């Protein structure tokens, strides 16, 4: 039916993971194993590995609570999922086919870029994929639009090639897929329903994503063999609203009350009631790193 889902915080661009987080907490489903002991793919600095010194067991108790739990789980999930689909060769191969696969997204990238800026294609549903493989795609674009190239790292996949789809696959299985998983895990990279479906497919979690205006289905993963509580969120600026159910309405209305407390507390921040209010502020106003404002408040324990 048409329903008014809860407004989930879009702090740290983890709005979907926050939706998945409170879905795992409202109906008491066990968190995925090794969410607290994994080695993240990212090679800059892992927000998950910084939080591992305060949480070691599905220990999430505060003594100074549901909103604070999803925001912490948002960080670990952002880096957990990519490490689960980087040595998964099956997903690596199943992600090239389909009307929305890499073969289609790349081919679309080449012909569409003749009149569309790359930033105009980065705001698309394939933005995360277009950014991870930006170097190969830009080489891919001008190589087929101009007759003279530059003598470079990607030309191996193009000589001795039968197709343009053989070059894309040769790039993908060598380094394209892993580059993609490394980009999904770094912060501030936002997710569309493309990545989410392959994320929900790798853990067999049914999900339905409606449009908040039409209530029509936008993206859907269906597996009737697994029977878990119905997971459904609506969304289009990248903001997801989790739909309530009989077991969630009073526990999400309790979480709605914190967020409304967090919003006004974050507007008098610039004598507050909520723990991580300064951590959810935008950058530059108070600190330079909202995340290090989060770990400062966790060290009080």
């Amino acid at each position: 039916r048409v329903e008014n889902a809860v407004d989930v915080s879009g702090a740290f661009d983890n709005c979907f993971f926050h939706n998945f987080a409170l879905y795992l907490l409202t109906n008491n489903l066990p968190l995925p194993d090794d969410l607290f002991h994994f080695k993240s793919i990212i090679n800059r600095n892992s927000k998950a590995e910084q939080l591992f010194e305060f949480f070691h067991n599905p220990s999430l108790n505060l003594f100074s609570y549901l909103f604070e739990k999803s925001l912490i789980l948002g960080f670990l999930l952002r880096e957990w999922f990519p490490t689960q689909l980087v040595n998964n060769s099956a997903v690596k191969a199943e992600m090239l086919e389909g009307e929305k696969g890499v073969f289609s997204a790349f081919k679309n990238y080449k012909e569409y870029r003749s009149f569309m800026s790359k930033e105009e294609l980065k705001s698309t549903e394939f933005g995360a994929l277009y950014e991870a493989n930006e170097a190969f795609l830009e080489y891919f674009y001008n190589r087929s639009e101009s007759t003279l190239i530059n003598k470079s790292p990607f030309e191996k996949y193009f000589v001795g090639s039968s197709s343009d789809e053989e070059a894309i696959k040769n790039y993908w299985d060598a380094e394209g897929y892993t580059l993609y998983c490394q980009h999904l895990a770094k912060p501030q990279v936002k997710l569309s329903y493309i990545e989410i479906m392959t994320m929900m497919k790798v853990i067999n979690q049914p999900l339905t994503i409606y449009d908040r205006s039409t209530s029509s289905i936008v993206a859907e993963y269906v597996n009737p063999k697994v029977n878990l509580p119905d997971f459904e969120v609506a969304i289009l600026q990248g903001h997801y609203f989790l739909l309530k159910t009989e077991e969630t309405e009073k526990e999400l209305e309790e979480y709605e009350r914190s967020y409304a407390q967090y919003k006004r507390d974050r507007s008098e921040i610039l004598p507050v009631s909520s723990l991580l209010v300064r951590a959810t502020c935008p950058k530059g106003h108070l600190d330079e790193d909202p995340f290090i404002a989060l770990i400062e408040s966790l060290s009080e324990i």
Side-chain angles (χ1 to χ4, degrees), residues 17-30 32 34-36 38 40-42 45-46 48-55 58-60 65-68 70-83 85-93 95-98 101-148 153-163 167-182:
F17 293 122
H18 297 160
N19 277 250
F20 187 52
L22 41 67
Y23 167 79
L24 285 188
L25 300 191
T26 37
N27 54 66
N28 304 96
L29 207 172
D34 77 270
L35 185 88
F36 293 92
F38 74 101
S40 151
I41 317 190
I42 76 183
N45 69 313
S46 151
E49 294 182 9
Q50 292 185 230
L51 291 154
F52 281 157
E53 72 166 70
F54 314 105
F55 309 100
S59 148
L60 254 195
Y65 296 80
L66 196 69
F67 178 92
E68 292 79 17
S70 66
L71 176 91
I72 285 145
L73 287 182
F75 291 128
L76 310 146
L77 289 159
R78 170 174 286 286
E79 311 197 6
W80 181 88
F81 273 104
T83 81
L85 41 73
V86 67
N87 325 90
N88 187 340
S89 78
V91 164
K92 174 199 234 176
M95 209 155 71
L96 298 145
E97 335 284 1
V102 182
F103 284 151
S104 308
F106 277 22
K107 286 185 222 182
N108 287 341
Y109 191 95
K110 178 210 326 197
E111 301 273 345
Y112 280 172
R113 216 187 162 274
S114 266
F115 66 104
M116 273 206 290
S117 148
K118 74 183 162 323
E119 294 84 358
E120 306 183 14
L121 287 119
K122 284 185 209 191
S123 100
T124 59
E125 44 283 358
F126 300 104
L129 179 92
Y130 286 178
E131 258 209 6
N133 317 282
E134 184 143 326
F136 167 86
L137 278 167
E138 276 312 306
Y139 184 76
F140 186 36
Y141 166 70
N142 73 262
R143 179 192 162 301
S144 321
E145 194 98 0
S146 157
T147 320
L148 299 169
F154 320 109
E155 194 48 31
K156 42 184 286 199
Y157 320 113
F158 280 105
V159 294
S161 56
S162 322
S163 324
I168 291 162
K169 191 166 150 44
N170 282 338
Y171 166 70
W172 191 249
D173 294 321
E175 44 164 320
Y177 185 56
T178 78
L179 279 171
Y180 182 54
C181 303
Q182 299 189 305

Side-chain angles (χ1 to χ4, degrees), residues 16-17 19-30 32 77 80-81 91 193-200 202-209 219-227 229 231 233 242:
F16 166 79
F17 293 122
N19 277 250
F20 187 52
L22 41 67
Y23 167 79
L24 285 188
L25 300 191
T26 37
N27 54 66
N28 304 96
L29 207 172
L77 289 159
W80 181 88
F81 273 104
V91 164
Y193 56 94
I194 293 273
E195 307 91 2
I196 289 167
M197 280 298 106
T198 87
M199 276 183 180
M200 297 291 114
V202 86
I203 53 160
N204 240 1
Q205 170 67 83
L207 171 60
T208 310
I209 293 191
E220 217 191 19
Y221 176 51
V222 171
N223 188 178
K225 185 261 315 172
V226 288
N227 278 320
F231 190 19
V233 307
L242 182 269

Side-chain angles (χ1 to χ4, degrees), residues 7 67 258-260 262 264-265 274:
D7 191 3
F67 178 92
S258 320
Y259 192 33
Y262 268 93
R264 183 89 258 209
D265 289 340
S274 313

Side-chain angles (χ1 to χ4, degrees), residues 236-243 245 248-249 251 258-260 262 264-267:
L236 159 50
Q237 277 74 234
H239 218 127
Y240 297 75
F241 303 76
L242 182 269
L243 293 211
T245 194
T248 61
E249 203 280 329
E251 256 202 84
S258 320
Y259 192 33
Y262 268 93
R264 183 89 258 209
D265 289 340
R266 186 188 314 148
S267 314

